[PDB]
Write a protein that binds this ligand. Sequence first.
Ligand SMILES: CCCCCC(=O)OC[C@H](COP(=O)(O)OCC[N+](C)(C)C)OC(=O)CCCCC
Ligand SMILES: CCCCCC(=O)OC[C@H](COP(=O)(O)OCC[N+](C)(C)C)OC(=O)CCCCC
Ligand SMILES: CCCCCC(=O)OC[C@H](COP(=O)(O)OCC[N+](C)(C)C)OC(=O)CCCCC
Ligand SMILES: CCCCCC(=O)OC[C@H](COP(=O)(O)OCC[N+](C)(C)C)OC(=O)CCCCC
Ligand SMILES: CCCCCC(=O)OC[C@H](COP(=O)(O)OCC[N+](C)(C)C)OC(=O)CCCCC
Ligand SMILES: CCCCCCCCCC
Ligand SMILES: CCCCCCCCCC
Ligand SMILES: [Cu+2]
Ligand SMILES: [Cu+2]
Ligand SMILES: [Cu+2]
Lengths: 49, 95, 231, 382, 382
Amino acid sequence: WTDWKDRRLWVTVAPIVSITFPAAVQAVLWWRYRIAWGATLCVLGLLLG
Amino acid sequence: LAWGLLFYPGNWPIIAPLHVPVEYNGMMMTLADLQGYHYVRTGTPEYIRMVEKGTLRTFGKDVAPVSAFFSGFVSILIYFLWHFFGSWFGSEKFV
Amino acid sequence: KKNIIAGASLYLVFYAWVRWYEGVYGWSAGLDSFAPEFETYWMNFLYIEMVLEVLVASVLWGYIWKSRDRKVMSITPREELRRHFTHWTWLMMYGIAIYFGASYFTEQDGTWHQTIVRDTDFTPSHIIEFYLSYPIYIITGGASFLYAKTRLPTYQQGLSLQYLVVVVGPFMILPNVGLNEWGHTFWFMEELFVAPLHYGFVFFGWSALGVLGVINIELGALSKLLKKDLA
Amino acid sequence: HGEKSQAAFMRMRTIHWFDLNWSKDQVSVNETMSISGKFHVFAGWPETVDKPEVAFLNIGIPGPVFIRAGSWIGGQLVPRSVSLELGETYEFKVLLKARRPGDWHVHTMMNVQGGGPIIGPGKWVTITGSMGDFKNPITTLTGETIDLETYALDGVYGWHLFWYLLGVAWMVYWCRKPVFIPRRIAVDAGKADSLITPTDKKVGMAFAAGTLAIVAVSMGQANEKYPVTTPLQAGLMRGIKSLELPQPTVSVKVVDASYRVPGRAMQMTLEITNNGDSAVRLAEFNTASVRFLDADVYEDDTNYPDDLLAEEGLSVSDNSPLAPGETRTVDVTASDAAWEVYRLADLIYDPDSRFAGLLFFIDEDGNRQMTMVDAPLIPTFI
Amino acid sequence: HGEKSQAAFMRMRTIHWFDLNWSKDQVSVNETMSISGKFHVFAGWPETVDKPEVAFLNIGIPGPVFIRAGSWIGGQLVPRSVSLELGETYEFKVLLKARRPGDWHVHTMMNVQGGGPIIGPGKWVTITGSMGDFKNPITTLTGETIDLETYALDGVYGWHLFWYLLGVAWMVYWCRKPVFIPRRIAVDAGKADSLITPTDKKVGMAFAAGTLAIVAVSMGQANEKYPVTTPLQAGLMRGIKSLELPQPTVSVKVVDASYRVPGRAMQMTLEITNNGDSAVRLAEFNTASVRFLDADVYEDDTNYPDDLLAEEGLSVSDNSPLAPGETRTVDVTASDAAWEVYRLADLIYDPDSRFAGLLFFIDEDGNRQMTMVDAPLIPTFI
Ligand SMILES: CCCCCC(=O)OC[C@H](COP(=O)(O)OCC[N+](C)(C)C)OC(=O)CCCCC
Ligand SMILES: CCCCCC(=O)OC[C@H](COP(=O)(O)OCC[N+](C)(C)C)OC(=O)CCCCC
Ligand SMILES: CCCCCC(=O)OC[C@H](COP(=O)(O)OCC[N+](C)(C)C)OC(=O)CCCCC
Ligand SMILES: CCCCCC(=O)OC[C@H](COP(=O)(O)OCC[N+](C)(C)C)OC(=O)CCCCC
Ligand SMILES: CCCCCC(=O)OC[C@H](COP(=O)(O)OCC[N+](C)(C)C)OC(=O)CCCCC
Ligand SMILES: CCCCCCCCCC
Ligand SMILES: CCCCCCCCCC
Ligand SMILES: [Cu+2]
Ligand SMILES: [Cu+2]
Ligand SMILES: [Cu+2]
């Protein structure tokens, strides 16, 4: 909801919980295949869904 | 730090139009509050809304930046932890 | 060694059928638990789907009957190369199923509460979410796992650990439905997120990251089936 | 709609909605209807339900088929949450604007933080027309009159589509190059520098610079295009007025109450007094939104939802005009199909077999007094 | 001093300090001054500020430049925390003793547990003399009169110095022996017994015994030198008396309030009644410690801090003697540099654009009535 996108809790929570999967997927899509994306892919999937 | 700090700036151009103030039946409300008021969410009463409400230890306008720096600092640790978590998920061990 | 059952993904037509059945037979004909219209279009649905899912899981999981000597690592890049393609067809099916189960219908159920339906004692967007989609993707994941176990040489060495996580891991949200409906009752919280009652099957989406291990494995016996033919 | 699944004792000992009035039952899109009445907070509140320090006057409907054009409690607009006191009576009113055609059950509910939804009686309202005609005009403190239904939409679409296409282009830059297999072999052999060439790293800078640039220009342009922007408002409204109703001189004491299991009937034994100045008579017993009336004394004239209205559901052993002083004891029997239809008989599964209700008395003139009753309900197994 | 950084709406809708009186503004060391007045707890308390079940009457100063010789609320000493009720008025008094020369801004504040500091208006007080002259004599329940400024100091110094010298001696016993390098080589080779010889281990016993001994002798000697010792006292003081002020018969209803952005002026529209028996007039509007007066009706005589005093800041369209009954509506304009100096105009950044204030009326005789006002403040953008 737009009326929940405030200045204190939204800005605090969204990025924190959002950075989880990008970091995890990056831990093998970088040292196994030097894949530059992987956070972009996570975010593209999240946004599409 | 970047992840934490780029969020609100990256979203502001999208939600700014909905922060124009409005006087509705004598009370002042933003267009976003007016939306939340008009379109009934029978399952989401207003009081569950976890948004900034002001305190005696809060300053007049300092929420957005302070919450983006705190979020960046915590994102540091979150990325740290989930790097190792993901390294584990990449394991090829057999049991 | 593909382009056959990969394009035969009937998941869309079937799921396109429920999204229609939902918006046509559960909008008002399923708003009230009542007794007649509900147990006609939604409870019979539930029973039929449970029995069909149990039987389809018991049947489809017969790759142990088609299993045999799987020394395809001694074979050239023809028989074993062909099996990996089948494995990845299974995995694409599993991906579609996981998408529809954990993303589409889960957030659709999220939409449903915010409108009217308080979870009290039930929801008809629950027959479609916890008892149709989750068992479907569970069946698909188990099928893929068993296929790899019974048909690829590199998997004959005892139950890859990460393959178990992109599997039974996502299975642990089904029994997790006990946490919710109990955290929604005597511990309720009318949200999806702050309510730690939902953190149960938040510890299930993580498990859906075991496709980092299956991919590492399937790109270690396959990297040795393509090395010689570089250019 | 889901009130039927809530604990029977909870539905009976929380909030009592009476004097309800629906201004219409057949509306067209863009038309308005109102719901008015009063509700009385029960002093014998349930223990597991937090006291209503924080409550929100809501509307029960399947999504925004109407829009809440306004809502008042005691004459004040209440867009925020409010505070209530146990034992008080409040007058409320809600103004709806029809938005989506169909037939909808419209309930009046009160969300109580730490408690839950407290659903009042519902009414069937029909909306006719086409949703494409709905208009939600609004004038801002700059005015600037806008249409809240579609305002700012193109901006959302444009910005999200732009950022998405930017992110897709990043992946596309690397997608043309064979991925996975050659990259695995490369780092496995020790050629970790697979496709991270200088030209491939300078593309990263452009993207990173073009990104950090667009954000700043966009912030500036937004500040210049919308010079006035307040934060999301919020905050309790403690100051809410109740109703100064005179104390019901007619005092009723429940000696004992029981209900037949199975069966759709309850039986009270009341000791009534008439400290008032005029002869009174028991007119209606209201509990859990069900209205049991005694046809010989009172009949409904507010189009109360029929499935909740028991015209002759109330049966008093002696409803002879109770005159001044003149204490008396009578056996009341409230029976109706709604006792079983609305799962009120499921009080047997409740870990608290008690009840609460609203007694209404009428004089010779036709005035009404409202008395509160409550006591344990004892299942009499047949 | 830091009140200027607190949320504007919080400063306006919490506690209102009035009838303030400072007994002096120029004190010498060892001299006393008092601060008296009343404060009214606002019933429309902020949601995020816990209700004042636990409050402490404090003093705002940069460290102990004064010492709080005493403090009363309603006549009782309040060294502990206290309880307050929303909507009550209390009389308070504080007694200070000058300790350190300089010029200090002395504020009256109320700490609210779960809330924060609620700072009242400050006054500039000057202390003259030399801090070396400060005396804090006290007589104990044994009496035994002591000087709390330096009492028991030699004991603290002696004991801490003794224990420190004991700990230094332990390290010194081992510091003469070459440390680090030879010790590393020793355990690396397998001579773990580097410098732990029997004589080195018997020194450990002496220290351990000499320590465990001194503690016991010292406990005994303390018990014998101070035979009477109570535990640190503490505990809420719920019983706090308020003020039985007659209900202000003059009733004021705010129709609407707005403020110019930018600008240092606010504008209310009041509907006033005079249910009283004598003709009244609007004298002062007090909000967030700022006092807007109407020179034609009332002028300050309490040396109120000038930077918070607007002698002619209040402007009423019609301040003609409002006689009995005789309802009326007027447009009030409270304007002063302090609106911008004390960051009250920053209500625009507050996620709650509302306000609360204190209206004072005066009769022909000169009596004062105190009415409470509160409503939404609407930024009128110029
Ligand atoms: C990429 C740098 C852009 C900096 C934009 C900015 O300073 O925004 C400040 C805004 C604070 O908004 P506020 O204090 O209300 O003042 C700005 C007024 N508005 C909200 C109307 C734009 O909160 C944030 O966006 C935190 C981001 C910090 C990045 C270093
Ligand atoms: C809560 C974070 C714990 C992550 C620890 C980890 O990376 O696992 C190390 C360990 C095995 O350690 P080791 O034999 O050294 O192998 C390290 C290589 N990986 C990371 C692939 C397992 O694997 C497990 O048993 C899974 C951990 C519990 C699930 C969160
Ligand atoms: C809640 C997180 C679970 C983390 C699992 C883990 O780190 O434990 C590793 C453990 C290590 O012992 P394991 O290798 O099972 O014992 C040797 C197995 N054999 C006898 C075949 C060699 O194996 C299992 O947990 C069993 C599989 C669990 C699937 C969810
Ligand atoms: C829900 C349908 C998903 C489609 C699964 C798929 O395409 O996998 C093809 C695979 C065929 O792979 P294939 O290499 O033919 O099987 C291994 C070779 N055999 C069976 C002769 C040992 O099917 C099976 O193994 C059994 C299918 C039963 C459900 C339709
Ligand atoms: C594995 C779950 C078993 C579901 C059994 C079933 O068909 O539901 C009937 C019954 C519910 O019966 P009841 O609510 O008394 O009456 C059903 C009729 N309606 C739908 C109108 C309420 O369910 C239960 O046993 C409790 C819920 C399952 C545990 C999560
Ligand atoms: C962050 C704490 C857990 C990290 C464990 C990772 C395995 C050890 C590194 C070789
Ligand atoms: C009283 C609630 C306590 C909840 C314990 C933690 C629940 C874990 C959920 C998996
Ligand atoms: Cu649900
Ligand atoms: Cu209904
Ligand atoms: Cu100061």
